[PDB]
XYZ file of C-alpha atoms in Angstrom:
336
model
C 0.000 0.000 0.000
C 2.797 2.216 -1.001
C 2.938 6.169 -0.042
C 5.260 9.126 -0.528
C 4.114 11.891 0.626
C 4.406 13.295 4.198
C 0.707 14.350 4.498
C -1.934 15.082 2.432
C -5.428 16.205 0.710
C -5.278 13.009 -2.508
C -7.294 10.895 -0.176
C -9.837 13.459 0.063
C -9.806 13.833 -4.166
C -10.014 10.522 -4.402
C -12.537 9.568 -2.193
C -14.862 12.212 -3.111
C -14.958 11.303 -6.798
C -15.764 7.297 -6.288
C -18.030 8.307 -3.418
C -19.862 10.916 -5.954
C -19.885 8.311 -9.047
C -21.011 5.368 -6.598
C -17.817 3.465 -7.194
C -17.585 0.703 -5.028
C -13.872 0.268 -5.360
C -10.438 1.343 -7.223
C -6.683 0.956 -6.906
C -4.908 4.637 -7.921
C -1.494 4.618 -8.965
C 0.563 7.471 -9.318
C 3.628 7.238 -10.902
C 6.119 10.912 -10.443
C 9.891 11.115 -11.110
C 10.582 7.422 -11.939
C 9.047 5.684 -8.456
C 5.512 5.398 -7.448
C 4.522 8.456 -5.477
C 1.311 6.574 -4.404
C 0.004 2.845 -4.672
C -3.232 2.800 -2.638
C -6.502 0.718 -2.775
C -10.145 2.821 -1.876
C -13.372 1.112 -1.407
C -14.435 -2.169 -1.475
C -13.397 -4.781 -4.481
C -16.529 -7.178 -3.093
C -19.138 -5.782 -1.408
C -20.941 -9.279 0.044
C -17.204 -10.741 0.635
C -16.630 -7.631 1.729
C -13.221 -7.230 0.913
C -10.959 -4.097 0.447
C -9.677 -3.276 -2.633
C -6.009 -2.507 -2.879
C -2.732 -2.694 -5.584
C -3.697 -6.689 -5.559
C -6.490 -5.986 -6.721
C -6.974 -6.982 -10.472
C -9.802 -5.384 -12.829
C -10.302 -5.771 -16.533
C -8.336 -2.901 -17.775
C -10.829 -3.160 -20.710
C -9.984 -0.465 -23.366
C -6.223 0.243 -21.778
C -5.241 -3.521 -23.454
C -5.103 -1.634 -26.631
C -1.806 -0.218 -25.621
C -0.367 -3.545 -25.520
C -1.869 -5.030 -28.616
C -0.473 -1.759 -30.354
C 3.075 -1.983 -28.925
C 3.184 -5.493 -29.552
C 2.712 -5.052 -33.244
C 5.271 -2.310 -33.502
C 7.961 -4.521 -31.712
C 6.693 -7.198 -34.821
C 7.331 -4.699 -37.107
C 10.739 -3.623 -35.766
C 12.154 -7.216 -35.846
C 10.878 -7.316 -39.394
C 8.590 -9.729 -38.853
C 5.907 -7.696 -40.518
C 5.410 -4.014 -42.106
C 3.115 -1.113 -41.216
C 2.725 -0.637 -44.525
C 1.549 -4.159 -45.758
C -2.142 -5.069 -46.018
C -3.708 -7.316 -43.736
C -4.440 -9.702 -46.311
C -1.043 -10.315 -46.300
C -1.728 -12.033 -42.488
C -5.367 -12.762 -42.562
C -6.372 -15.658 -44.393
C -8.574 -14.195 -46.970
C -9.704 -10.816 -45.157
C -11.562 -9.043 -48.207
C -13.595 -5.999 -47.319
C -15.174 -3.327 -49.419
C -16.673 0.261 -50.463
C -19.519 0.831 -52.793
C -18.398 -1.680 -55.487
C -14.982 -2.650 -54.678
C -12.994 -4.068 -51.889
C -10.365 -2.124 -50.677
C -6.757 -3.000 -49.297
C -6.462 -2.136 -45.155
C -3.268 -1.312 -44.395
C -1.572 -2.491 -40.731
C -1.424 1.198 -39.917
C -4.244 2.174 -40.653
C -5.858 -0.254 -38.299
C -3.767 1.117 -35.762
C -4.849 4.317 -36.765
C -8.543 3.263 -36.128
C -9.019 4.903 -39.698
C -9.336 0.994 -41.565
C -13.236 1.788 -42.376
C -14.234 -0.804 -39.714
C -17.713 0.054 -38.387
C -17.703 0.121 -34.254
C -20.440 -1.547 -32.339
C -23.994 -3.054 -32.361
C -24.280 -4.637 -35.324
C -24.198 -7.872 -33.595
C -27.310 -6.887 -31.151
C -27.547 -8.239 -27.454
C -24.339 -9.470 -26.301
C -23.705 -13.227 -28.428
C -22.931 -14.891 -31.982
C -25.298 -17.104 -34.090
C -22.766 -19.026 -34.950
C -20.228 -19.496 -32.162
C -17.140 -18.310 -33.272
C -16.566 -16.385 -29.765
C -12.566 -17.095 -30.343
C -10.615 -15.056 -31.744
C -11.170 -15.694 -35.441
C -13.436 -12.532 -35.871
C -12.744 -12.218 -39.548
C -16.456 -13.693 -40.635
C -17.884 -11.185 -38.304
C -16.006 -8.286 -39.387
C -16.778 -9.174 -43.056
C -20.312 -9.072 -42.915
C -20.680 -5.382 -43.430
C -19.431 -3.004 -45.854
C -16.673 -0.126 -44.654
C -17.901 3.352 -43.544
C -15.032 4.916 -45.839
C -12.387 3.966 -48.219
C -9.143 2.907 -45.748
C -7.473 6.052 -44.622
C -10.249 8.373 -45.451
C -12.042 8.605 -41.981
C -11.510 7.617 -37.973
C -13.701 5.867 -36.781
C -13.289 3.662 -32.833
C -13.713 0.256 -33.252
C -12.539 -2.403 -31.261
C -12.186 -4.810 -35.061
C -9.058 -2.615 -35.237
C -6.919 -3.940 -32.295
C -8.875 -7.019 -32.628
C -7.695 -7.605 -35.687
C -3.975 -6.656 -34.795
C -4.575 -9.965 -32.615
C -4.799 -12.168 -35.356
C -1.876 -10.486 -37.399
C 0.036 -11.006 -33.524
C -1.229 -14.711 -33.338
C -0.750 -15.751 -37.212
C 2.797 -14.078 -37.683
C 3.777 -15.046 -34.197
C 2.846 -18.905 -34.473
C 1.152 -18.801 -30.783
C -2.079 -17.620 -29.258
C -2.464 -13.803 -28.178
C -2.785 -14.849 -25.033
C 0.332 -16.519 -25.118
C 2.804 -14.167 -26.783
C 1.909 -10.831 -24.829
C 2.630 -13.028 -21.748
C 5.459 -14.677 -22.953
C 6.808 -11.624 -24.864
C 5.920 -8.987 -22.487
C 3.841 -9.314 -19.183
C 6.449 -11.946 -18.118
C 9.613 -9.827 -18.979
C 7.996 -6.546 -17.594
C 7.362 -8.359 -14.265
C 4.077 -7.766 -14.654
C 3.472 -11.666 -13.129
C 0.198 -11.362 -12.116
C -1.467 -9.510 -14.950
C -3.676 -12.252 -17.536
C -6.402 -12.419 -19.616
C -10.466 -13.017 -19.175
C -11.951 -15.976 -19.776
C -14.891 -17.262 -17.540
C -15.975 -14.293 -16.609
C -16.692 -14.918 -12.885
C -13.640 -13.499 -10.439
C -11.473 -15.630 -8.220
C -10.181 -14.132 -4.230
C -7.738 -11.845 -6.178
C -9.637 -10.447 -9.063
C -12.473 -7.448 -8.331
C -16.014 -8.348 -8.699
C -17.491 -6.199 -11.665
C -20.351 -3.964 -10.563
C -23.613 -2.543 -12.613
C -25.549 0.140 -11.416
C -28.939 -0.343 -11.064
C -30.942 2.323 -9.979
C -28.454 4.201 -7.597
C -26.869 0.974 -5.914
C -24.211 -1.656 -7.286
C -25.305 -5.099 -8.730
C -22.466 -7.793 -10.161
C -23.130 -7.982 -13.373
C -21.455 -10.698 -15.367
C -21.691 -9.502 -18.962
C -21.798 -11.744 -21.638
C -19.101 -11.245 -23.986
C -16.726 -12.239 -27.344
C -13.412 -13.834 -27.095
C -12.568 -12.370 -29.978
C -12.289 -9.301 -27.913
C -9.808 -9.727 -26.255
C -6.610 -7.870 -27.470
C -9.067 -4.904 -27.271
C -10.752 -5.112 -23.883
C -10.066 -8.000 -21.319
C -6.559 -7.489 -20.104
C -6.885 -8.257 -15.990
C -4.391 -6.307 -14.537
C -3.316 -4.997 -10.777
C -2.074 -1.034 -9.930
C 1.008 -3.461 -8.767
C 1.997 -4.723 -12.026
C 0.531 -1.842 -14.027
C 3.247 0.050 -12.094
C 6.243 -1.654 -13.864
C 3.960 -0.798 -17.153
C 3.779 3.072 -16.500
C 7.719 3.017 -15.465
C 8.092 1.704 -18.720
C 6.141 4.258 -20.703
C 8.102 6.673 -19.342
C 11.771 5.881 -19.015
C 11.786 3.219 -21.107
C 15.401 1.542 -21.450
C 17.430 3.008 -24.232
C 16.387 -0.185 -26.548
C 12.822 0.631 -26.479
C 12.795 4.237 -26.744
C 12.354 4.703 -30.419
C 9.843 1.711 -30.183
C 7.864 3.763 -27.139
C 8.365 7.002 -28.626
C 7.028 5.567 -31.842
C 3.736 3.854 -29.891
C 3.206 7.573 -29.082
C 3.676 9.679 -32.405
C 0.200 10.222 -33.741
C -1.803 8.668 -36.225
C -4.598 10.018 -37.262
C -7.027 12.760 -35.524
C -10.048 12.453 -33.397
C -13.070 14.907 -32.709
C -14.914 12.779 -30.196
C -12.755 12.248 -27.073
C -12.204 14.745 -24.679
C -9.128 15.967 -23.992
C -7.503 14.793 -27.030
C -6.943 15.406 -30.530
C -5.303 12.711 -32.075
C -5.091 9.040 -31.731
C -1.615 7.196 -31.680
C -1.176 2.968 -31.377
C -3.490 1.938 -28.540
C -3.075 6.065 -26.942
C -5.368 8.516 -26.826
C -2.697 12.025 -27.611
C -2.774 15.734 -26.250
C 0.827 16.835 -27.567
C 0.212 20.535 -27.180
C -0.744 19.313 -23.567
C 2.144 17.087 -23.418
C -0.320 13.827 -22.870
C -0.838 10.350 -23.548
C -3.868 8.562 -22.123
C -6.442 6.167 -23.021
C -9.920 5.688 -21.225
C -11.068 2.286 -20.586
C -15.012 1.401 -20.295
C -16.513 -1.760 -20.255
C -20.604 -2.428 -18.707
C -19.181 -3.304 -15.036
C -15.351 -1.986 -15.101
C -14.099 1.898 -15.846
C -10.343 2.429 -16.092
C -7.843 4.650 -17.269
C -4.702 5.636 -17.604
C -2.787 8.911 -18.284
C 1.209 9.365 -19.025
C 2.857 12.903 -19.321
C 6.448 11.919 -20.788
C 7.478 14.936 -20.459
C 7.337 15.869 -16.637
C 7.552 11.710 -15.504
C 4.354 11.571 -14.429
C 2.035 8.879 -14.273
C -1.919 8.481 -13.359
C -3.417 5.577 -13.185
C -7.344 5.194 -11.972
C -8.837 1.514 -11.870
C -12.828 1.118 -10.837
C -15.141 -1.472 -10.530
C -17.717 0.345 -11.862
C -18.463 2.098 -14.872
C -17.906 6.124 -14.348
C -17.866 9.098 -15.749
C -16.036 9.965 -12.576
C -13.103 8.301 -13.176
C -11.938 10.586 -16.524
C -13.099 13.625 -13.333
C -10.796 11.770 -11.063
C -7.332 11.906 -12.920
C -8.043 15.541 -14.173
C -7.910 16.115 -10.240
C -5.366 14.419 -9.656
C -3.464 15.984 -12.535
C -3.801 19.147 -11.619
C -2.392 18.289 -8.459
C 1.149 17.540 -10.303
């Protein structure tokens, strides 16, 4: 339950913002001149168990995966493995997908770049397939429907995008998502703890997921796509995530281009926030001197925000779904 600071008012931030958005429980890191300032657990990860949450605590990150499915690509790309620039027929079976009349090549990049064509959400309905591919093989989903724009034209969020990038991680790679990022990364990192969803009903360790109803909590257990998962179901601690935000920003000298690189923009967004721009799995404020990504799934909220310049790292994990956790780490900036 790490602390440096000799006394202070972040307590009183932090607990008025969950308190306000009826967040039963989150773990806040904050990361400032290369060691955590603050590792500290608030609320309640299980209400009936009643257990505290704290930096063991592990919630589905949901949206903050991206990140990793992002870097992992670029690290691909840097070995040589595969190119930015090559389409992802190239890696896909037979991934044909088009506009008006014509299919039209997708580049790597520019499913990174979110600006691929790939429509976002709903088309599926209520929460299930009619034909049970809920691993990852998405392709026959995503083909379904025609693009929004010609590739490059347009951004548009979609979780396809970085759901895709798992395939083209899992076919070049010659192992399961799942597998390489652990093998490749959350291993090395030290981030031992940190895995993937699957079952979708928590263990002693991992946070119970919570649905408001009403005005009070209710688990909810949402039904969801395996598929998915380089997107959304990461299950990370504030403990491991803290060797992740380290490496954002110092990363060792080998894997500064390839950091500096996951942060260089991509393509420009109108819809989020505080941002502008959207770079490999980060949300980007660069006049600001930002990188963040917001996280929201029906029962989690999470997110996380870097400043490279300045060291400075905020990271907000909540059982709950909340507007109030974006509020919370503008607070908490502004106290840095």
């Amino acid at each position: 339950r790490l602390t440096n600071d000799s006394q202070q008012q972040i307590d009183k931030i932090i607990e008025h913002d969950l308190q306000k958005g009826h967040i039963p429980g989150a773990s806040i890191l904050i990361v400032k001149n290369g060691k955590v300032f603050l590792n500290k657990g608030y609320g309640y990860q299980d209400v009936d168990k009643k257990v505290k949450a704290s930096p063991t605590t592990k919630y589905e990150i949901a949206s903050n995966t991206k990140a990793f499915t992002g870097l992992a690509i670029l690290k691909l790309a840097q070995e040589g493995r595969l190119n930015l620039n090559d389409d992802v027929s190239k890696h896909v079976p037979h991934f044909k997908m088009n506009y008006n009349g014509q299919n039209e090549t997708i580049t790597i990049k520019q499913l990174l770049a979110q600006t691929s064509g790939i429509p976002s959400d709903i088309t599926s309905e209520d929460a299930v397939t009619n034909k049970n591919n809920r691993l990852n093989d998405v392709t026959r989903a995503i083909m379904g429907d025609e693009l929004h724009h010609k590739p490059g034209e347009e951004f548009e969020y979609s979780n396809m995008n970085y759901d895709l990038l798992g395939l083209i991680i899992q076919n070049v790679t010659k192992q399961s998502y799942t597998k390489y990022i652990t093998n490749s990364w959350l291993k090395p990192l030290h981030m031992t703890h940190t895995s993937f969803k699957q079952t979708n009903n928590k263990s002693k360790h991992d946070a119970i997921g919570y649905e408001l109803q009403g005005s009070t909590p209710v688990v909810s257990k949402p039904e969801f796509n395996l598929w998915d998962t380089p997107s959304a179901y990461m299950m990370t601690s504030t403990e491991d995530l803290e060797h992740w935000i380290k490496f954002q920003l110092n990363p060792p000298d080998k894997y500064k281009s390839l950091v500096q690189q996951s942060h260089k923009n991509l393509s420009s967004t109108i819809g989020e926030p505080n941002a502008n721009a959207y770079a490999s799995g980060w949300f980007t404020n660069n006049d600001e001197h930002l990188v963040f990504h917001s996280g929201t799934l029906d029962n989690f909220s999470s997110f996380i925000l870097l400043n490279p310049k300045q060291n400075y790292g905020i990271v907000v994990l909540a059982n709950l779904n909340s507007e109030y956790v974006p509020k919370l780490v503008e607070h908490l900036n502004t106290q840095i």
